[PDB]
């Protein structure tokens, strides 16, 4: 699990091999977040082998599909439940974000945990991504965007293209 690129979401279902002892095994659905579907089906076995006694040698993937966003043009407040590991013991977390797709939020969560806690991607176990309303929010860094009349300027502007006219004559204005 290398959290490369924008993550996607996959609904992968599997089951044990059919045996004369048990006619048809039950089906197990998951929600995996992976860059490509190949490392999705691998990350699938990692979870099911610790919630069940099943391994890839005694299972079969039944459906490796990608699920798209129901409303990619709506802004949403996503609630993520984590299981990351530090250098000393593992912890449960509840991190909140604000994005357009759940995969857009999960990616954002992976960059943030790496940024705020120096945890690499192989240490984190996303367990629940729930769409919650603006009243059930808890983290203050996202509640501040709940305003029908939000209004804010752009402060002192970090001038880009600072190398295209590399040797100018005028002092570059930063107040737009």
């Amino acid at each position: 699990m290398k959290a490369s690129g924008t993550l996607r979401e996959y609904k992968v279902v599997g089951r044990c091999l059919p045996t004369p002892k048990c006619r048809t095994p039950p089906l197990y659905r998951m929600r995996i977040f992976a860059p490509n579907h190949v490392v999705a089906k691998s990350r699938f076995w990692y979870f099911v082998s610790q919630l069940k006694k099943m391994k890839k040698s005694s299972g079969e993937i039944v459906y490796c599909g990608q699920v798209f966003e129901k409303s990619p043009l709506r802004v949403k407040n996503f609630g993520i439940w984590l299981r990351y590991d530090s250098r000393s013991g593992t912890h449960n977390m509840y991190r909140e974000y604000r994005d357009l797709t759940t995969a857009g939020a999960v990616t954002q969560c992976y960059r943030d945990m790496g940024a705020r806690h120096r945890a690499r991607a192989h240490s984190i176990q996303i367990m629940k991504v729930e769409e919650i309303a603006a009243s059930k929010c808890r983290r203050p860094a996202v509640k501040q965007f709940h305003d029908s009349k939000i209004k804010f300027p752009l402060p002192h502007r970090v001038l880009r293209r600072q190398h295209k006219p590399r040797f100018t004559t005028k002092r570059p204005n930063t107040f737009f």
């Binding site: 699990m1 290398k2 279902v13 490509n36 190949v38 490392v39 990350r43 079969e60 993937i61 039944v62």
Partner: protein, 168 residues
């Protein structure tokens, strides 16, 4: 649901060099005819073959080839092992001379035997010299670690077709 058939064909490309290799791995990589870096080969899959592919998992980058992926490999890099001599396939009378005892008399036959793994794959696949692929144009991600953890070694199931387009 519809569980599709597990793929009967695999294209194996060696990615690591020859220096400092385990003897059990070295014996296997010469049974797959992969004595050189970036050499390719087709392998028909079965329980007796996958368990050899697990042994050389850090050294190979294999997957399931596409129909186009076979065409480009046989046309551009196809060389027949005619009388223990690597000879290009610029004429059909080089195949039908040697593979004529298996009704393979053209290149489309030879592709049809390789792609749809038939009952004459062994003589067909051993006829082709190991493919001398080029270095991957575009650059690998990481030669060392497994494809699942960001690297490039291991079973990149359908993505092996993308790897061919650049290396071929």
């Amino acid at each position: 649901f519809y569980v599709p058939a597990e793929p009967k064909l695999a294209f194996v490309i060696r990615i690591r060099g020859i220096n400092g290799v385990s003897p059990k791995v070295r014996k296997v990589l010469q049974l797959l005819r992969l004595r050189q870096i970036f050499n390719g080969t087709f392998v028909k899959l079965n329980k007796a073959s996958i368990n050899m592919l697990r042994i050389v998992e850090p050294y190979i980058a294999w997957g399931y080839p596409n129909l186009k992926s076979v065409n480009e490999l046989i046309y551009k890099r196809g060389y027949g092992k005619i009388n223990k001599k690597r000879i290009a396939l610029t004429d059909n009378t080089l195949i039908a001379r040697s593979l004529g005892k298996y009704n393979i008399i053209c290149m489309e036959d030879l592709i049809h035997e390789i792609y749809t793994v038939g009952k004459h794959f062994k003589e067909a696949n051993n006829f082709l010299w190991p493919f001398k692929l080029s270095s991957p144009r575009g650059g690998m991600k990481k030669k060392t670690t497994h494809f699942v953890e960001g690297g490039d070694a291991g079973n990149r199931e359908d993505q092996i077709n993308r790897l061919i387009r650049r290396m071929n």
